[PDB]
Amino acid sequence: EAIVNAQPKCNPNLHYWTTQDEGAAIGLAWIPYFGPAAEGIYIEGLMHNQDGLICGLRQLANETTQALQLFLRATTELRTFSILNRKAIDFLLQRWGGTCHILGPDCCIEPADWTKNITDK
Amino acid sequence: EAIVNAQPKCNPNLHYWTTQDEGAAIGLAWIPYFGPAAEGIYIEGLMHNQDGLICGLRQLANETTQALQLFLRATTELRTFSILNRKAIDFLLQRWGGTCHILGPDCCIEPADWTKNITDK
Amino acid sequence: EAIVNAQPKCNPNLHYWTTQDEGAAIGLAWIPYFGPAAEGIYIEGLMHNQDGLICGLRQLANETTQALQLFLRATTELRTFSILNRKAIDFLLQRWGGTCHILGPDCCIEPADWTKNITDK
Amino acid sequence: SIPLGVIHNSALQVSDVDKLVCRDKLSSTNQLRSVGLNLEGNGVATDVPSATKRWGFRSGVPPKVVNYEAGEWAENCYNLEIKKPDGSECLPAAPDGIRGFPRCRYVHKVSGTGPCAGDFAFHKEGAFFLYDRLASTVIYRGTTFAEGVVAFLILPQAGYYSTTIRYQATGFGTNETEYLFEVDNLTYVQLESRFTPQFLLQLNETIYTSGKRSNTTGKLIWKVNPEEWAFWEXXXXX
Amino acid sequence: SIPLGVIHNSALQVSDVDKLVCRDKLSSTNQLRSVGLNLEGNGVATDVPSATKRWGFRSGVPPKVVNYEAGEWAENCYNLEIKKPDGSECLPAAPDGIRGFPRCRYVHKVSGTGPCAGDFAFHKEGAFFLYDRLASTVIYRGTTFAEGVVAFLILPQAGYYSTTIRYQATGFGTNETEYLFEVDNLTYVQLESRFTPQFLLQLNETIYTSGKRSNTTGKLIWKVNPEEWAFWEXXXXX
Amino acid sequence: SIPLGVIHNSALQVSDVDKLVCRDKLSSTNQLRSVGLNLEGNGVATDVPSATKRWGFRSGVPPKVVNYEAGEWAENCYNLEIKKPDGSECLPAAPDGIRGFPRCRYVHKVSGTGPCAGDFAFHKEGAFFLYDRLASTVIYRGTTFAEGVVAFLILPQAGYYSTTIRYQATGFGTNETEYLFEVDNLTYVQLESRFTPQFLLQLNETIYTSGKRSNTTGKLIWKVNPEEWAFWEXXXXX
Ligand SMILES: *[C@@H]1O[C@H](CO)[C@@H](O[C@@H]2O[C@H](CO)[C@@H](O[C@@H]3O[C@H](CO[C@H]4O[C@H](CO)[C@@H](O)[C@H](O)[C@@H]4O)[C@@H](O)[C@H](O)[C@@H]3O)[C@H](O)[C@H]2NC(C)=O)[C@H](O)[C@H]1NC(C)=O
């Protein structure tokens, strides 16, 4: 489906905060005893509305709430950390969870270079 | 292995309860503030012993206990929610965790339509 | 990268302890009520420095700390149990997360027996 | 390895781990389900005397909890409030997020005392205590549970009334446990294994409508005169 | 199913589950991101009177928490200390590991009393209370939060100052809630919905530098004389 | 990214993330293992004076715990009971489900006082405190731990005696910490870094069998007269 922003307003600029898992630390700053406190682990960025991405995200998160709330109602886990990993597994099962019939629509295998190598032989 | 029910009796009818994660709510019932209390989130169904499925399930759960208990003894996680996701990952590694040798027994790739497309050319 | 042990010493022998999830119990020892207490669930083994594996492991765990600590700083999960499962998912996405171009370098499909079966026909 | 159930040739089977069936299709994690099945369904005696003999106290074993997604309507569930003779509690409070089993025709609420020689109460046959979508190896205090066991499955690709029955118990969890069924706070019935839930409710109503309740401030206890099919198929009274 | 955002044809879209796009490449779990976006950004009124009307108390619904990895700098956040008239707390202490929202230009700290007819306080529109990388369905006591909603994404493969504004409240969470903005412990201003954060700070400074603070031991309360664009674009005083 | 160990050409290596080796086979999650290795094995001094200098108190950093599946039998472990001079505890109680390290030849149980200028006690070199299959960034009170570090691996496809040594400490975690080894509740030995576990046990037995224990109600403290290989390879006494 396409994303139709139906909000009264849109802040088209997204001033965001997050963390970095990879961040190669300078010297000994990775040691918890020497490193930053909880308040100082964040990085910041600014993203504008190119391709209308920012206003779509505001509309996407709004439309996500119903399904998300129904998922939380039906789980007994107090804190849910597994949604994105379960989506990665589902991405693989959608493609590789059955026998892969080559040239079929539900199989992502390309026999292009293999079909040309056989023609050359 | 086949499932041999070795219990003194079997209730062949399974009156069951569960939840639904997908359930498209009517209006505003998905909002936790307006929605059902903990006691009213369940759906019900009834399943009979076609193919002897119900008596097999009673026997399957009984035979599962030993392995399950040994798995819980060896984990330090207080509440385990990851068994089914780990089984999905193991399903994919059993098939796609190595190089897929086509026409081999441990590779689920079908070159049928690709072998006929080459014959036509 | 290769593993360069840069520690002052190395105990080349690894006297280790662990648990076994599979362990087919004798009779009724799998029942928690009858089974071993927390102190008696461990198995032991001894591994020597063949292929220099033991001294590499001491060096590998040392070099793992920085990345691991930075990962723990950026998670809000109090106890992390999902690192190895996330690595298994990443192993599959690295191979099967896109279209698999046969004979390409980023696709682990072997058309050997299929290419010879076509030549025989 | 933990067994996984699957349907081949119109029969439920345990999936062979050492064997690979490419015809088996798993297209989403929604095809995987964990289910809980009640010991009732296998024909175990469900009366309070028989059921409590299957539980016992043990120290040194950490409790463990596993999730399950779907369960069976139970005829019999249990809810325990057990103290030692010095008033200290025997069972732990229910952890955050653990609620009682959601469908119980009869809840057998047992209150009393026992030695409680152990930090936690386990199932002697290795079964689980089934709560609201969580299965535990131990009994929690005052929390309704059904006895059951868990299965894991690959699915092939495509009102409610509850009644509480109260019991008093002494010497809980021993060779010589005594049980009394409670009519009101001053009228009890000496409990036998042969007394079904339906019989206890009719015994309670006939006592209420016959005036056989205690009309003093002391305890009245009755003993029913002595005068093979599962649920899906002092003074005397003669 | 929970929607997942993806970029096709230079536009964000919801991925069709029933449709398979082999051209979509997911090469590592790092391409998947969960993000939190503030209700501010959609144009909701952020003043304390309007914001508190969106929350309410309810029993029988267990709280739930979901993780998110990246968030938006908020202009307005909220921090509540609400007791019942008998001094019992209305909101629960923050669970271990739950900290306040990390970027807030203005923290509206509200202290007061209300009936609190419910075990937990929920968002009436179904939104979340955003904390430090955790989103909750309920408000925690004395913990700073932004109102927001969560999205899930497939990425395509490749200073900070905060100011606390204190309010006293009576009849919190009802039809007739009264709010006072706090200058010091003995000087308040009758609060209107039209008062912006910038206006409250200039009102506080002008009161401090004009000597309009209470120079007795009793309460002084002012009422500002009566004399359409979002943030990114007794006595009287006339 | 977190490194992953793998065996190529008869040598352990770090797997190159940017490189894809189709010959590497991962057929089940059982091939993946997390292991914990003790700082002992790298040659660090294990005596109580040297070991405690590696720990320190810090506020503002939330503790973190990571799981590991297999560990190494330790020669030296540590168990701390540290209070401030006003009797308030310095270390937190062990969270539910965290038990002591399971294999320790010698447990150095240290009791005493210190300033404890920080909410939690961390490893100054970034190492972990290894418990029963859980690794923590902080020390828990009265819980036995080994110092160690964690590795992650792809495996290629295919009695026990413990002895407790008690110490008293003052000024714990400072430049000038004093340590006494405890013979009984009234007899101590001034502790040096050069004293090995085997030497402390022989010093204790010779004191017991020589009658050098305190036979009054007061403290007796001894000082041993002054008269380069790892473990796998007042009054005076002269
Ligand atoms: C899965 O199903 C199995 C079969 O239904 C269950 O097996 C049960 O295992 C327990 C012990 O774990 C047995 O209890 C023992 O019984 C013996 C003697 O048997 C007495 O009871 C039988 C009634 O069946 C009676 O006929 C005899 O004459 C005896 O009076 C005692 O000496 C032991 O101390 C212990 O009580 C059950 O008898 C047994 N049931 C059956 C039908 O064989 C198994 O427990 C199930 N697993 C789970 C996890 O639920």
Ligand SMILES: *[C@@H]1O[C@H](CO)[C@@H](O[C@@H]2O[C@H](CO)[C@@H](O[C@@H]3O[C@H](CO[C@H]4O[C@H](CO)[C@@H](O)[C@H](O)[C@@H]4O)[C@@H](O)[C@H](O)[C@@H]3O)[C@H](O)[C@H]2NC(C)=O)[C@H](O)[C@H]1NC(C)=O
């Ligand atoms: C996702 O975005 C949606 C659209 O922006 C949000 O919809 C909002 O839904 C709530 C209820 O869930 C509505 O509040 C109700 O309003 C009616 C009457 O509307 C009054 O307010 C409007 C202001 O928009 C005003 O113009 C009218 O004259 C009324 O005075 C009340 O009777 C109800 O009791 C309830 O308060 C919002 O009005 C509505 N917003 C819009 C812009 O339509 C939705 O909540 C978002 N979802 C999440 C999870 O954030």
Ligand SMILES: *[C@@H]1O[C@H](CO)[C@@H](O[C@@H]2O[C@H](CO)[C@@H](O[C@@H]3O[C@H](CO[C@H]4O[C@H](CO)[C@@H](O)[C@H](O)[C@@H]4O)[C@@H](O)[C@H](O)[C@@H]3O)[C@H](O)[C@H]2NC(C)=O)[C@H](O)[C@H]1NC(C)=O
């Ligand atoms: C992984 O292995 C590394 C190498 O074995 C470990 O490196 C250690 O890092 C710490 C700091 O993080 C160093 O301690 C510092 O030492 C300096 C001065 O060195 C003094 O000690 C050495 C003994 O090696 C001695 O020879 C010198 O003359 C000095 O007296 C101090 O100024 C600092 O304040 C701090 O104490 C270790 O020296 C260093 N070890 C080695 C062998 O280089 C690293 O910590 C390991 N990582 C983990 C997570 O365990």
Ligand SMILES: N[C@H]1CC[C@H](NC(=O)[C@]23C[C@@H]4C[C@](c5ccccc5)(C2)C[C@@](c2ccccc2)(C4)C3)CC1
């Ligand atoms: N979101 C929806 C996805 C499908 C889901 N359905 C089940 O949870 C079943 C619904 C019924 C009964 C069953 C069960 C309940 C309790 C105990 C044991 C089993 C659970 C088993 C089930 C089944 C088992 C074996 C083969 C085929 C079906 C049929 C699935 C409903 C919600």
Ligand SMILES: N[C@H]1CC[C@H](NC(=O)[C@]23C[C@@H]4C[C@](c5ccccc5)(C2)C[C@@](c2ccccc2)(C4)C3)CC1
């Ligand atoms: N370890 C690194 C991996 C990449 C990561 N980057 C993001 O977390 C974005 C960085 C910015 C902003 C964005 C966001 C923040 C808050 C609320 C909503 C969105 C988060 C979205 C993002 C994006 C969204 C949609 C398409 C493409 C990019 C761009 C990703 C930084 C750390």
Ligand SMILES: N[C@H]1CC[C@H](NC(=O)[C@]23C[C@@H]4C[C@](c5ccccc5)(C2)C[C@@](c2ccccc2)(C4)C3)CC1
């Ligand atoms: N369910 C069974 C699956 C296999 C499992 N075995 C291991 O847990 C090893 C058993 C030994 C020792 C080892 C280890 C222990 C402590 C610290 C570091 C390593 C752990 C490493 C191991 C190994 C390492 C590297 C290459 C090959 C083997 C050999 C695996 C036993 C239970």
Ligand SMILES: *[C@@H]1O[C@H](CO)[C@@H](O)[C@H](O)[C@H]1NC(C)=O
């Ligand atoms: C009671 O328990 C004791 C010990 O548990 C045992 O000796 C005895 O046989 C049991 N039964 C009776 C009837 O005493």
Ligand SMILES: *[C@@H]1O[C@H](CO)[C@@H](O)[C@H](O)[C@H]1NC(C)=O
């Ligand atoms: C019976 O006793 C219980 C607990 O002692 C009490 O809560 C209840 O009110 C009593 N009922 C009557 C009618 O006294």
Ligand SMILES: *[C@@H]1O[C@H](CO)[C@@H](O)[C@H](O)[C@H]1NC(C)=O
């Ligand atoms: C016993 O009978 C009385 C009379 O109606 C009833 O009120 C009471 O609830 C009954 N007790 C039980 C346990 O059903």
Ligand SMILES: *[C@@H]1O[C@H](CO)[C@@H](O)[C@H](O)[C@H]1NC(C)=O
């Ligand atoms: C009082 O108690 C006696 C004995 O239990 C009983 O026979 C009598 O019926 C009771 N009174 C009434 C009014 O029922």
Ligand SMILES: *[C@@H]1O[C@H](CO)[C@@H](O)[C@H](O)[C@H]1NC(C)=O
């Ligand atoms: C106050 O609340 C009551 C009940 O919630 C309602 O009847 C009334 O309309 C509300 N408003 C006023 C102004 O009283």
Ligand SMILES: *[C@@H]1O[C@H](CO)[C@@H](O)[C@H](O)[C@H]1NC(C)=O
């Ligand atoms: C104002 O009141 C608060 C809480 O009652 C108190 O902590 C603070 O010290 C007071 N400030 C002054 C200046 O008295």
Ligand SMILES: *[C@@H]1O[C@H](CO)[C@@H](O)[C@H](O)[C@H]1NC(C)=O
């Ligand atoms: C109000 O003004 C005084 C004067 O500088 C200042 O100290 C105080 O912090 C101000 N209050 C707020 C909430 O900014």
Ligand SMILES: *[C@@H]1O[C@H](CO)[C@@H](O)[C@H](O)[C@H]1NC(C)=O
């Ligand atoms: C004392 O209070 C009065 C009334 O609030 C005010 O007019 C006066 O300025 C105050 N005193 C000073 C010194 O400001």
Ligand SMILES: *[C@@H]1O[C@H](CO)[C@@H](O)[C@H](O)[C@H]1NC(C)=O
């Ligand atoms: C003691 O600690 C202080 C401050 O931490 C430092 O100045 C001094 O060098 C240390 N050592 C001694 C021997 O005082």
Ligand SMILES: *[C@@H]1O[C@H](CO)[C@@H](O)[C@H](O)[C@H]1NC(C)=O
């Ligand atoms: C020594 O002291 C400890 C703690 O103060 C105490 O528990 C123990 O009983 C004492 N031992 C003797 C022999 O007095």
Ligand SMILES: *[C@@H]1O[C@H](CO)[C@@H](O)[C@H](O)[C@H]1NC(C)=O
């Ligand atoms: C010290 O020696 C005595 C004498 O046998 C013994 O009982 C005691 O346990 C010893 N202490 C330690 C710490 O080994």
